[PDB]
Design a protein around this ligand. Sequence first.
Ligand SMILES: CCCCCCCC/C=C\CCCCCCCC(=O)OC[C@H](O)CO
Ligand SMILES: CCCCCCCC/C=C\CCCCCCCC(=O)OC[C@H](O)CO
Ligand SMILES: CCCCCCCC/C=C\CCCCCCCC(=O)OC[C@H](O)CO
Ligand SMILES: [Cl-]
Ligand SMILES: [Cl-]
Length: 388
Amino acid sequence: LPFLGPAVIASIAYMDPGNFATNIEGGARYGYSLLWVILAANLMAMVIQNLSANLGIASGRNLPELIRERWPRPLVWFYWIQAELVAMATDLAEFLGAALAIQLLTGLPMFWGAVVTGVVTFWLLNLQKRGTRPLELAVGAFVLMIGVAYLVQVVLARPDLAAVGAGFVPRLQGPGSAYLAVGIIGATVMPHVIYLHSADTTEEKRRLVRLNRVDVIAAMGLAGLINMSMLAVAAATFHGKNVENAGDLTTAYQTLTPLLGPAASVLFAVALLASGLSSSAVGTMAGDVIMQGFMGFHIPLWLRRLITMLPAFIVILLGMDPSSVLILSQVILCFGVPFALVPLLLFTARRDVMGALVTRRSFTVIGWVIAVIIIALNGYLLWELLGG
Ligand SMILES: CCCCCCCC/C=C\CCCCCCCC(=O)OC[C@H](O)CO
Ligand SMILES: CCCCCCCC/C=C\CCCCCCCC(=O)OC[C@H](O)CO
Ligand SMILES: CCCCCCCC/C=C\CCCCCCCC(=O)OC[C@H](O)CO
Ligand SMILES: [Cl-]
Ligand SMILES: [Cl-]
């Protein structure tokens, strides 16, 4: 593949419907003041995903399998349940985003939107490796081109450069800002990948480590520029204008209207649907690998797909706002990150696991600082959600 090739394919996988929810709402409600969050969360994701990838290369096993073989039964069971909750919140945002996109495209109610998504995800579940390549290449194009749109639009929108520069200085402005900051971190780090991304020769093992290190930083850098662009465009579009339903995904197409014209609405919803269909399908398979890795057995794949749809339909029948619950799921995912980092930081520092590929002492320290920072942000948010 060409030089930039790997950076493009891995970046579209990072574009969750939860990124749309957090970037649009972040810019429309708090201007440019959360740009440092997207930047910080992206750098932390570069460290974390590198440790996750180097653990699979050095040890030949994934994190659930290493926990199952090395830790006591009650701790394996605890981390299995915690990993299953991460899979629930991860698939909830993706499945609900696709159903919402169906509603934006056709006008059907959210219930039937989730039913359409359910048939598609059930049918996509049956298809083997043959057939996924034409569909995953098409959804990659929609999501990639909507990302290039925001990269171009961030220049044509003429954003307030003084406010853009100030937005890179870390500032939390109220309790609602921390809630959205936590959601941005949860949407960037993606703890479900931590448990799955891990899934011979020392000189050959170092080649894959150096090769993976370059590809993930090019992809995270591209995904980080697009996320900041989507937030900055949302800030320039809505912030300080008292627009009806500002930051909401039902009116988010207005961010690309001066560029795409009358096509902005369909092109946004199509990209939202493609971002949710591919993500909901790969995540429910990743949930199957995680249980088999933790427990040594797995439930039928159709049953897991059904259980993951139950929170989606319940949220719909409750009448809850889809854009609001997409942000909540990313907030919950951010609470699962510190639990995922503890086995990651410990295993990658052991020679009997990594061999000659033991992590540098400095990057282990940086990883623990990242874990302490996220615990601090989660506890700070949890304190203000219980009064105090
Ligand atoms: C709490 C939620 C739990 C819901 C409980 C199930 C609800 C029934 C739905 C579909 C059953 C029919 C679809 C599956 C039947 C064919 C699938 C199959 O392959 O056989 C099933 C069996 O597990 C060997 O694999
Ligand atoms: C304000 C920001 C606060 C965020 C906190 C700082 C996060 C960024 C720090 C370093 C990034 C460098 C990571 C680039 C890739 C490094 C490779 C790696 O992660 O691990 C390899 C290991 O060292 C093999 O032995
Ligand atoms: C507690 C709240 C405020 C604290 C804020 C600072 C966080 C604590 C400092 C470092 C964390 C532990 C990192 C240092 C231990 C790393 C383990 C290590 O590097 O050991 C060598 C490794 O085994 C090579 O093989
Ligand atoms: Cl261990
Ligand atoms: Cl401003």
